[PDB]
From a paper:
The basic unit of the structural organization of HtrACj is the trimer, with three monomers arranged around a three-fold axis. In the higher-order assembly, four trimers of HtrACj arrange into a dodecamer, characterized by a tetrahedral symmetry, consisting of 4 threefold rotation axes, running from each vertex of the tetrahedron to the center of an opposite face, and 3 twofold axes, running from the middle of each edge to the middle of an opposite edge.
We have demonstrated that [name] [name] is a periplasmic protein, but it can also be secreted into the extracellular environment. Extracellular HtrACj is involved in virulence as it cleaves the adherens junction protein E-cadherin, an important factor required for maintaining an intact epithelial barrier.
Author numbering:
A (entry chain B), B (entry chain A), C (entry chain C): 38 to 471
The structure:
């Protein structure tokens, strides 16, 4: 007979079930979903009244169930922090040895949502940690933990997606997808490859009944490697940022922003390291000295893997022109004021109640800002806006003064183009600014 | 590592994702269901507030999200018709080249629910369009497209049921069925064999919330291959009929109707191409010039795949002889009228309120139709019916006259046997009319 | 092509579909859930309005729908009891033969919820009954029958859990699990190995949507093998017991109760075949002559595969010493009463309201039981309990007299340690009795 138990024999020696007595399970508390209340038996079941009364799965209310992986022979375990929030007596149960000591939280971060914990025994297994990004889609894998109280279990699968954020279960995310039947209680148990080496970790699943419908998510194993090291070596993680807001370059933005390529600065968050290194609006982020940028979630989760105060000679372009300049890693809590202008670009413009005829007898249609002149480079002249125009609406939405221009012009480096409405000598026309 | 990415590889460049901008998304409007309503975040998620705001999945109410297949190098895409119903500005994402043109809707048919659509670029992919019906159950397949908007993501699995109607997603059906995980947004997307060739087109799934639960359905490629052609040729498909209600031959119906075999005409829609070809009731449809019949979904779907005014020399049998005249392909809209028979054949029956003693003083029990003669070949004569009985009942249901008699004696060829109740020279028997 | 249709050929030849017609479907009536209602179509769909009307799958209100297996060439089929509860006119549709007879129920046992039924024809197949316990996690299998009324469909998978109770669908349980997708109506249908031999029988599935979401459940084929012989033999099965209460030995029980290894008797159910074989409380059950015990679910389900009145020369131990004596298979309804001592072991206690100064005026903290002596072996003197104490409560719970004392000192053999509350000359201590 062919079986792939052969992974399953050793994989349990690393992948723990977790017993988790906590006086406060208030982070891993269910939200007001209309679930199997009114006849709640053993947790995460569905069946009717059956003879085995309470005791088997109950403690999840003033304790928690979960899974973890012992990363090193030092007996340091990893699991998801929602599983280990309020870490009093985080008892474990290792399938393949049945041992039941308290574990000692060494350190956590709720942003990456991850923890490292010393279990107090010796001759504890490590895990062959390998790289989550040698993967292709279609690669075979085994995903592991204790699903919904059955005991320790493993489901055979393939990858069906790579390196996915837009998920934000907490704050920093790069998930990889398998089709494998996995549940909560596999919360912190592993995803290994077909050779039984560590490639990601389970936490959560897109599905309708909490148990799998095709769409299991693992964290990267490379992510947890450096995350665990930072949670060991100071007992937490400490990020800054480049003090920024960011998007990806979109296809129509690209030609409109003169066919440079990288992540779109939306707004540089003033006087942070971005600004001081001379990054601006209409610029694009291209590369960290270790890591390549195209998207907003690239810088976010790369900085979810960098620490305080080190300088970074980051590469960036504007228009057609690259610089590499020197930026301190400066967070949201780290920013001291700065400049940007790129559809207010030599716009000499000012407030009105103008001194000419004739339109009508209401300020509604004539407060805004009047154009003194328009720089040749400004996307306005690309697009047919001229000196002696009057701006009344900016992205269809209307304005009364310079403040409410400069507020909508601070949202333009978030628009491929702008639907301005510009009154002239007599009529208001519609333009398409890029 | 063994990975069947190799299919995945070229199937993205044929199996499209759809930026289906249309202003009336109201033919695929969500049914009034208790889903994740009042607080739905991104469409087709389950989740509580995560850091990423709106801007990734929301457009599906003034657009749609889907998948399709470029069949020939013309760039003739096919997808579901319901994805493109009201087809205004249907623009594309071709996974792996990102080409955001609109496509011309060349034509759509809402009975099969499929449409042919020219994408206005070049070097656009064929697909290797093999037979769905050379498939057996257990054969290995991949399942393709974009599930719930996660982007282009594939699965692989096996066939667990074949060549099926009784699903009624539209008006013409013959789906084949896999375990592999597929959701909404794979709507119109491919099912390819282990070798990478098109054996079917995914349109729906038997699940409990739209994430796959082992039961996904793809239209056979061989039906889409003649659908797409009739829609390339004139922008629509025109289907006929034989003018004939139809069923499968049930098991006692074989032995009652003397051991013929074929699809059971339940009642002829009168004087049609069936009737003028000799097809009556008590008759069984066996074969179209090209296609073999035992059930009514055979004749239905074979007519689905044929167009008007041609003469089909179809074969049928009655009692114990098989005949071969010729039928026009004549619609429900097309049918002159007709002759019927069965359990009234050469019977002589007329109305009553009788002139003999005795019974009772209420008409409920004695109105009906009386029996002058019963033909010897007739089913009544198989089954305990006599001359000088009075029919009161025609299958546990009662009659006041010839009309409600001859109406149930139209429904007797929807029966294996009939429970007539028949008042005799003094008492009401009950009988078994094979 | 590689496909495992090879087993799917001869499996259908024994794995029946059933059209279980009876007037009383009132055991397999739906329970009040928010499953689909007010809008039903065909049973176990989810789908909106389809052009295939009532007639396909209504009947399971006034019939059952299920699966089974023809065991032997004698025509003897095996299925759930709940499928044939009130076996009126149990009609069959064996796939690939269609022989629409009634079957004759030979016998049933609701306890295992298993049947044996004769189908009344000739040349009927068998099934290759192999061992369910030469088995392992991860071996390849197939799961079979009628998944929601479709015909004969088969899925394929790997074993994900072994020999289990705590599922409780009836009264006796030793199920095995695989991921492979099975629905009610596979009720009574099979699980066969990768060579086509019978290893398991699916009854139900711990799903979220009633169709399989990952967690099917097969009673072992070596359990239904002898069950079937006891059902052929006489139409029913006869279960005794050994007239007892049992649990598995907990780890700190192990160490307190002197490091013996078996199933923990919790309370001997008094003058059974246990007590009159010398078996006591705090004695561990090690081996039945044919079946080795470590848990209660052992002895339960071994009784679940054993008949009346035979004498069973069973192994038990006390503290460090093994005995083997003989035990009749005596029911819950078969036991003359009784011998009982454990943390009352030499405890010479009596009722009080006691004649010394001073404490308080309310009886609430001084009614209880006074301790005249404590024998040296008592887990009391292992743990701090002395003579002249006063027991006021036994594991937090307060006692008023000898009767309430002894109710709780009967349940201590359901504990590893007890937190007795014992008043002394002036104060009350809490203790930890092992």
């Amino acid at each position: 007979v062919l079986s792939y138990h052969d992974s399953i024999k050793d994989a349990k020696k690393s992948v723990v079930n977790i017993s988790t007595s906590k006086t406060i399970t208030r982070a891993n508390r269910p939200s007001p979903l209309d679930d199997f209340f009114n006849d709640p038996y053993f947790k995460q079941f569905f069946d009717f009244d059956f003879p085995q009364r309470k005791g088997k799965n109950d403690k999840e209310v003033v304790s928690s169930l979960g899974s973890g992986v012992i990363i090193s022979k030092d007996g340091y375990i990893v699991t998801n922090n929602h599983v280990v929030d309020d870490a009093d007596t985080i008892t474990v149960n290792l399938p393949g040895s049945d041992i039941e000591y308290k574990a000692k939280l060494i350190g956590k971060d709720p942003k990456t949502d991850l923890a490292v914990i010393k279990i107090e025994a010796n001759n504890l297994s490590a895990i062959t940690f390998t790289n989550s990004d040698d993967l292709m889609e279609g690669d075979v894998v085994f995903a592991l933990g204790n699903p919904f109280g059955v005991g320790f279990s493993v489901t055979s699968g393939i990858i069906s997606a790579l390196n996915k954020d837009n998920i934000g279960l907490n704050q920093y995310e790069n998930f990889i997808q398998t089709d494998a039947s996995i549940n909560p209680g596999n919360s912190g148990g592993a995803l290994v490859d077909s050779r039984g080496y560590l490639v990601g970790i389970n936490s959560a699943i897109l599905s309708r009944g909490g148990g799998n419908n095709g769409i299991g998510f693992a964290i990267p194993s490379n992510m947890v490697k450096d995350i665990a090291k930072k949670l060991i070596e100071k007992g937490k993680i400490d990020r800054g940022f480049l003090g920024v807001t960011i998007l990806a370059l979109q296809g129509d933005t690209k030609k409109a922003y003169k066919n440079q390529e990288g992540a779109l600065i939306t707004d540089v968050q003033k006087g942070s390291s971005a600004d001081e290194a001379g990054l601006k609006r209409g610029d694009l982020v291209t590369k960290v000295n270790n890591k390549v940028i195209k998207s907003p979630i690239d810088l976010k989760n790369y900085i979810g893997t960098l620490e305080i105060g080190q300088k970074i000679s980051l590469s960036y372009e504007r228009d057609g022109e690259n610089k590499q300049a020197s930026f301190i890693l400066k967070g949201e809590k780290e920013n001291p004021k700065g400049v940007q202008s790129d559809l207010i670009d030599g716009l000499s413009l000012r407030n009105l109640d103008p001194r000419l005829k004739d339109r009508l007898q209401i300020p509604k249609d004539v407060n805004g800002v009047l154009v003194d002149s328009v720089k040749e480079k400004s996307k306005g002249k690309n697009s047919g806006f001229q000196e002696g125009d009057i701006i009344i609406g900016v992205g269809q939405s209307e304005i009364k003064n310079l403040k409410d221009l400069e507020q909508a012009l601070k949202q333009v480096n978030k628009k491929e183009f702008t639907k301005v409405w510009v009154y002239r000598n007599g009529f208001a026309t519609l333009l398409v600014l890029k």
